[PDB]
């Protein structure tokens, strides 16, 4: 009894070999700025945790984005602030410009640099084959950089990818769920968004790593190339695994929970059944075939695997033939 331990194939000990204050976010002292520098213009969007507004910095007349954080555990607030600052400057990562507070109620707000307010669920169904390749590569730059800096995003989905299509500019946003990787650590399986949850979360396996993000990136790519959104459309967390199992096959799933000796939740017993590994060509049809190539299908297949350890790392993914034509244009 008891689960087999796991560890990341890359950047396993980047946090071990850094000063505590890098990853000990509970101890981070927040340096507050002047709230009266920022005035609101319009609401951009909302979430469970936050309310988001476009605003103007009256000192220099520039547009900003203010993510107002609803009451949560101070712990969670510091975690996001530390991560945003550790990754600040990095490729395709959102730039945190300032942190402010309502001196009376003490509601904290994050101030980011302006991003053109079009996420991915917005045009990523009218993009060309090269466009999908191009933007997928840009997500991998951020995913490789934040992994290399010892951080897993834990909520990769289209709502969290901001695209200025006019300027071919991409930003990976919302790090309120991101967490530091420490080998051996048992993490919370309650992360992401149902449709982007990795198998490891759905079976309650806690010793996951950066690979979780690669599953989610798989779910995105499948959605974009096959033109089905979301790709795995589960009604609850248990059903979510049944949807995945209908595509990947139940054989590799029972192999997976054996390799890692994971005690399944009793309410999976009679629900999963027996399903074959389906061929990726099955989801191809006339509306989507212009986006589906053999390189796309090989790449997808190497991302969407039950075994987190067999999934491509973000750096490995970047090496795939699917991006050869992008990497060629990029060197210019």
Partner 1 sequence: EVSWISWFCGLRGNEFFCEVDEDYIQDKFNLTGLNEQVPHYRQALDMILDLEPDEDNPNQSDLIEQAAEMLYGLIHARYILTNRGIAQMLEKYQQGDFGYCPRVYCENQPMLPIGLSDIPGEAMVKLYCPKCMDVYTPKSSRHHHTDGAYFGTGFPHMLFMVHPEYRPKRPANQFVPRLYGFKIHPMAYQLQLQAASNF
Known binding positions for ATP: 44-52, 67
Task: Give the interface segment with partner 1, choosing from 64-72, 116-124, 134-142, 143-151 (CB under 8 A).
Answer: 64-72
Residue pair 298/321 in contact (Cβ under 8 Å)? The answer is yes
Task: Give the interface segment with partner 1, choosing from 62-70, 114-122, 170-178, 189-197 (CB under 8 A).
Answer: 62-70
Residues that bind partner 1 (rule: CB under 8 A) add up to a total of: 29
Residue 58 Cβ vs partner 1, minimum distance, rounded to whole Å: 7
Which 3-state string (H, E, C) describes 68-93?
EECCCCHHHHHHHHHHHHHCCCCCCE
Give yes or no: 155 in active site.
Answer: yes
Residue 112 Cβ vs partner 1, minimum distance, rounded to whole Å: 15
Quick check: 41 binds partner 1 (CB under 8 A)? yes
Query: What is the torsion angle, in degrees rounded to the nearest 10, for the CA atoms of residue 95, residue 188, residue 228 and residue 136?
Result: 40
Residue 218 CA to residue 311 CA, distance in Å, equals 10
Residue 21 CA to residue 42 CA, distance in Å, equals 36
Nearer residue to partner 1 within complex by CB, 93 or 97: 97
* Placement of tokens 């299908």 in the chain: 297
Task: From the candidates 119, 155, 209, 213, give the one annotated as an active-site residue.
Answer: 155
Describe the crossing of helices 211-226 and 129-148 by its angle, rounded to 10 degrees. 170
Residue pair 64/127 in contact (Cβ under 8 Å)? The answer is no
Quick check: 101 binds partner 1 (CB under 8 A)? yes
Task: Give the interface segment with partner 1, choosing from 35-43, 130-138, 155-163, 198-206 (CB under 8 A).
Answer: 35-43
Quick check: 68 binds partner 1 (CB under 8 A)? yes
Quick check: 58 binds partner 1 (CB under 8 A)? yes
Among 20, 73, 267, 328, interactor with partner 1 by CB under 8 A:
73
The binding site comprises 44-52, 67
Among 5, 24, 27, 40, interactor with partner 1 by CB under 8 A:
40
Quick check: 36 binds partner 1 (CB under 8 A)? yes
Residue pair 322/312 in contact (Cβ under 8 Å)? The answer is no
Cross-strand partners of 51: 46, 68
Nearer residue to partner 1 within complex by CB, 5 or 45: 45
Count the neighbouring beta carbons within 10 Å of the beta carbon of residue 258. Answer: 10
Q: Which of residues 245-304 bind partner 1 (CB under 8 A)?
A: none
Distance of CA 253 to CAs 59, 250, 272, Å? Answer: 57, 5, 10
Beta strands in the chain (DSSP E): 38-46, 50-57, 62-69, 96-101, 108-113, 151-152, 161-164, 169-172, 179-180
Quick check: 117 binds partner 1 (CB under 8 A)? no
Among 38, 215, 226, 322, interactor with partner 1 by CB under 8 A:
38
Task: Give the interface segment with partner 1, choosing from 36-44, 164-172, 295-303, 306-314 (CB under 8 A).
Answer: 36-44
Nearer residue to partner 1 within complex by CB, 88 or 190: 190
Nearest C-alpha neighbor of 241 from the set 211, 210, 197: 197
Quick check: 190 binds partner 1 (CB under 8 A)? no
Q: Which positions touch partner 1 (CB under 8 A)?
A: 35-36, 38-43, 46, 48, 51, 53, 55-56, 58, 66, 68, 70-73, 100-105, 107, 109
Catalytic annotation, residues = 155
């Amino acid at each position: 009894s008891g689960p087999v331990p796991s560890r990341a194939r890359v950047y396993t000990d980047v946090n071990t070999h850094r000063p505590r204050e890098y990853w000990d976010y509970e101890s981070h002292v927040v340096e507050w700025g002047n709230q009266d520098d920022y005035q609101l213009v319009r609401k951009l969007g909302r979430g469970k945790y936050s309310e988001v507004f476009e605003a103007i910095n009256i000192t220099n007349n520039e547009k900003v984005v203010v993510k107002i954080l609803k009451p949560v555990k101070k712990k969670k607030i510091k975690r996001e602030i530390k991560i945003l600052e550790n990754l600040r400057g990095g490729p395709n990562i959102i730039t945190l410009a300032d942190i402010v507070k309502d001196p009376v109620s003490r509601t904290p707000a994050l101030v980011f640099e302006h991003v053109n307010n079009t996420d991915f669920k917005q045009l990523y169904q009218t993009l060309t084959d090269y466009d999908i390749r191009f933007y997928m590569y840009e997500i991998l730059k951020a995913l490789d950089y934040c992994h290399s800096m010892g951080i897993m995003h834990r909520d990769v989905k289209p709502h969290n990818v901001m695209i200025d299509h006019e300027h071919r500019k991409l930003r990976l946003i919302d790090w309120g769920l991101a967490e530091f990787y420490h080998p051996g650590q048992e993490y919370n399986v309650r992360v992401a968004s149902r449709y982007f949850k990795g198998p490891e979360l759905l079976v309650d396996y806690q010793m996951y790593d950066y690979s979780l993000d690669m599953w989610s990136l798989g779910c995105m790519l499948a959605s974009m190339i096959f033109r089905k959104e979301p790709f795995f459309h589960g009604h609850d967390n248990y059903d979510q695994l049944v949807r995945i199992a209908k595509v990947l096959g139940t054989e590799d799933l029972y192999d997976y929970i054996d390799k890692y000796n994971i005690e399944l939740d009793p309410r999976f017993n009679d629900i999963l059944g027996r399903h074959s590994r389906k061929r990726w060509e099955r989801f191809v049809h006339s509306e989507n075939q212009h986006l589906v190539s053999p390189e796309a299908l090989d790449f997808l297949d190497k991302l969407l695997r039950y075994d987190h350890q067999s999934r491509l790392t973000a750096r490995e993914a970047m090496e795939h033939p699917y991006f050869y034509t992008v990497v060629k244009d990029q060197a210019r």
